[PDB]
């Protein structure tokens, strides 16, 4: 069988910018795991139908797996714009696989500030699909060169999304899982 | 290190016990609190973990309808119910804290509460 | 769930002399390094010694030494005292089934 419940199921996300891949190869792929858990808020599909996955063989699964709030989970899609989409994480315009998020709330916010979740910010030009930044070079807004030395219109890229308990649905921290399709189910 | 739980106890099958698990000795920077039990002669089985602070409790595979994690109004001892108690169910409950955050290790551990189950 | 088969179930050596405890857990794939190690002795609840591969506790000697990475994981204890007669369980704090090991049983000779 395929380690699903080692890519759903881990205790360590990474961060948007520097979001994991895992491979999933040789196994047998068993998605009715999927749909039939309680907690999984988003499982949206791009180009296969989410019931006919287990009828469908793939050479390669790949998961990609982040953590991002509820306002930007609506930006892991083909052809979206914004922040998570741009700078951080694009989906191709052809896409062919699932996006699953699921709020975790309990499991990445911290009544003093979680801070352990990065995001990039600014960047000089927009991500290319599937393309990995964890360059954290000191940003240039302006035209007076920053010489790694962040100040004025010298932005460091990374952000911290400081996930508390008591933020709202929106702001709470959401595990994101993207699995990427181009393995048989049974 | 050694957070103080409750003292040994004796249930009548079909019973109900109250394990409560004092950690107000030590300062954590940890928002989860988790509970291992432990069987007379088996080793050590995750049990689940309750949220500090939010009170979310979370179980484990086989330790779900019948154990219910709860917490204090401060926050600060976490209780534990069994209820429809059997006879295999005699065990020692361990109370573990992590010391920090997303360290999902054990640092902290309780003195054991073992509650048996006979007549 | 990730389940461990920590062997050998029971150690029986000299004082003096090196202990090897293995802990291999059924991770696809692999755990990288979320392994900790606890030791309880008779009576006392579990005390934590390594957490992580290999980095120690705080207050844990340096005798208690460990190894592996993803699958296969080692815990040596070099010069064994008879306070070191225990039982000793492997977790995995990698996936949310957190799941200890079987456990083995130190014997001093």
């Known amino acids: 069988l395929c380690p699903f419940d080692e890519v759903f199921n881990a205790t360590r996300f990474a961060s948007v910018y520097a979001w994991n891949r895992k491979r999933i190869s040789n196994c047998v792929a068993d998605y009715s795991v999927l749909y039939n858990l309680a907690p999984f808020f988003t499982f949206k599909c791009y180009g296969v139908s989410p019931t006919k996955l287990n009828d469908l063989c793939f050479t390669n699964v790949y998961a990609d797996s982040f953590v991002i709030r509820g306002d930007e989970v609506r930006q892991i899609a083909p052809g979206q714009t914004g922040n998570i989409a741009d700078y951080n994480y694009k989906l191709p315009d052809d896409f062919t696989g699932c996006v699953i998020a699921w709020n975790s709330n309990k499991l990445d916010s911290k009544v003093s500030g979680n801070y352990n979740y990065l995001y990039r910010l600014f960047r000089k030009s927009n991500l290319k699909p599937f393309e990995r930044d964890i360059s954290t070079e000191i940003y240039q807004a302006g035209n007076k060169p920053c010489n790694g030395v962040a100040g004025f219109n010298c932005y460091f890229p990374l952000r911290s999304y400081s996930f508390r308990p008591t933020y709202g649905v929106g702001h709470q921290p959401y595990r994101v899982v993207v699995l990427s399709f181009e393995v048989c189910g049974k | 290190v050694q957070l103080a739980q409750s003292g040994s106890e004796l249930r009548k099958p079909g019973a109900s016990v109250k394990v409560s698990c004092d950690t107000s000795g030590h300062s954590f920077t940890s928002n989860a609190i988790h509970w291992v039990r432990q069987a007379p002669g088996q080793g050590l089985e995750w049990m689940g973990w309750?949220?500090?602070?939010?009170?979310?409790?979370t179980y484990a595979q086989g330790f779900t309808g019948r154990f219910v994690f709860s917490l204090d109004t401060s926050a600060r001892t976490a209780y534990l119910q069994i209820s429809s108690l059997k006879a295999d169910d005699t065990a020692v409950f361990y109370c573990?804290?992590?010391?920090?955050?997303?360290?999902?290790?054990?640092?902290?551990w309780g003195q054991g509460t073992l509650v048996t189950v006979s007549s | 769930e990730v389940v461990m088969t920590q062997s050998p179930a029971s150690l029986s050596v000299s004082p003096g002399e090196r202990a090897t405890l293995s802990c291999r857990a059924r991770?696809?794939?692999?755990?990288?390094?979320?392994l900790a190690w606890y030791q309880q002795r008779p009576g006392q609840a579990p005390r934590l010694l390594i957490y992580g591969a290999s980095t120690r506790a705080t207050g844990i000697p340096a005798r208690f030494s460990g190894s592996g990475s993803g699958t296969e994981f080692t815990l040596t204890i070099s010069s064994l005292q008879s306070e070191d007669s225990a039982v000793y369980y492997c977790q995995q704090y990698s996936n949310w089934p957190l799941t200890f090991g079987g456990g083995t049983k130190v014997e001093i000779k």
């Open positions: 573990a804290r992590e010391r920090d955050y997303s360290d999902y290790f054990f640092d902290y």
């Open positions: 991770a696809s794939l692999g755990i990288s390094t979320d």
């Open positions: 309750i949220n500090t602070d939010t009170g979310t409790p």
